[PDB]
Amino acid sequence: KDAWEIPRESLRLEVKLGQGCFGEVWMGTWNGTTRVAIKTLKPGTMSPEAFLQEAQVMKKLRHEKLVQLYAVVSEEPIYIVTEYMSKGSLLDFLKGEMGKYLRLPQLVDMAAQIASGMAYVERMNYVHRDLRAANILVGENLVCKVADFGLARLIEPIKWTAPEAALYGRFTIKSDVWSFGILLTELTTKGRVPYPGMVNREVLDQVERGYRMPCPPECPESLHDLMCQCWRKDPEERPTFEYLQAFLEDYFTSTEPQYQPGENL
Numbered sequence: 001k002d003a004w005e006i007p008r009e010s011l012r013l014e015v016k017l018g019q020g021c022f023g024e025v026w027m028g029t030w031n032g033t034t035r036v037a038i039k040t041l042k043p044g045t046m047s048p049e050a051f052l053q054e055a056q057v058m059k060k061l062r063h064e065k066l067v068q069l070y071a072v073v074s075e076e077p078i079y080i081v082t083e084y085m086s087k088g089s090l091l092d093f094l095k096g097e098m099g100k101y102l103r104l105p106q107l108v109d110m111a112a113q114i115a116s117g118m119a120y121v122e123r124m125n126y127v128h129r130d131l132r133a134a135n136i137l138v139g140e141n142l143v144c145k146v147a148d149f150g151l152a153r154l155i156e157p158i159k160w161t162a163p164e165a166a167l168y169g170r171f172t173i174k175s176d177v178w179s180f181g182i183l184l185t186e187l188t189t190k191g192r193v194p195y196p197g198m199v200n201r202e203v204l205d206q207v208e209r210g211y212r213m214p215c216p217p218e219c220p221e222s223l224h225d226l227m228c229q230c231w232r233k234d235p236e237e238r239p240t241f242e243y244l245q246a247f248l249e250d251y252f253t254s255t256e257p258q259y260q261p262g263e264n265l
């Protein structure tokens with residue numbers, strides 16, 4: 001077994017935070033000292049070989065904007081120990097009591113962090129396939145991180161999916177860029193569902209005819225332009241995450257030097 005393997009008695013599961021058919025998620029303590037998130041896998045749901053393959057991936061990706069794997073109990077029942085993201089999902093963060101205080105400088109810094117995590121995914125030649133606010137985790141001091149997208153995919157959203165991926169199964173880093181554009185609308189609306197009022201079938205129909213969401217209220221046109229680059233019909237014309245990270249990092253000097261705070265953004 002690996003240097004990642006830990007004894008079962010070194011973990012305390014203190015608070016249950018989430019529940020699905022896959023298993024559960026807990027806040028707990030590791031070795032009596034370390035605050036951790038503990039994801040359990042229900043026995044019998046997944047092939048040990050498949051878990052072994054995904055575990056290898058998890059132990060190879062280290063990035064400050066990717067939630068860090070800490071340890072594993074890799075025999076059934078399986079436990080997965082990661083750094084604890086104390087605010088939960090970005091979706092819940094934006095919808096909850098904090099959303100009303102967030103302004104455009106905070107939201108764009110959050111987007112820059114997520115781009116930085118996806119930039120790393122990009123240069124490691126991986127694909128997320130479900131980039132959206134429900135799958136981003138938030139910690140203290142507005143830190144945002146990309147979660148365990150590989151394990152998520154194995155365990156398993158038309159409105160976040162690029163058309164070539166939704167129709168033809170063409171999932172690439174360029175379809176993650178499209179999703180990142182949708183996530184920009186989540187940030188600027190404080191977590192509203194995209195394409196408000198439209199059902200999935202009409203979203204798909206319209207987007208093929210060239211429909212794109214309009215500029216959200218109080219969002220600068222230059223940020224809506226960036227969204228529209230992410231939603232280019234040709235995937236190869238969409239920008240890289242490396243470009244998205246640099247544009248968002250530099251935004252309030254290079255792009256909107258005259259930004260003034262408003263009622264909501």
Ligand SMILES: Fc1ccccc1CNc1nc(SCN2CCOCC2)nc2c1cnn2CCc1ccccc1
Nearest residue numbers: 017018025037067080082083084085086087088089148
């Ligand atoms: F497996 C792996 C493997 C490698 C990297 C990352 C992971 C997943 N590591 C997590 N996974 C999950 S999934 C949980 N869902 C369900 C409920 O709310 C949305 C998220 N949550 C996590 C973590 C790490 N910290 N947290 C916080 C959860 C939370 C919820 C509510 C309040 C405070 C904190």
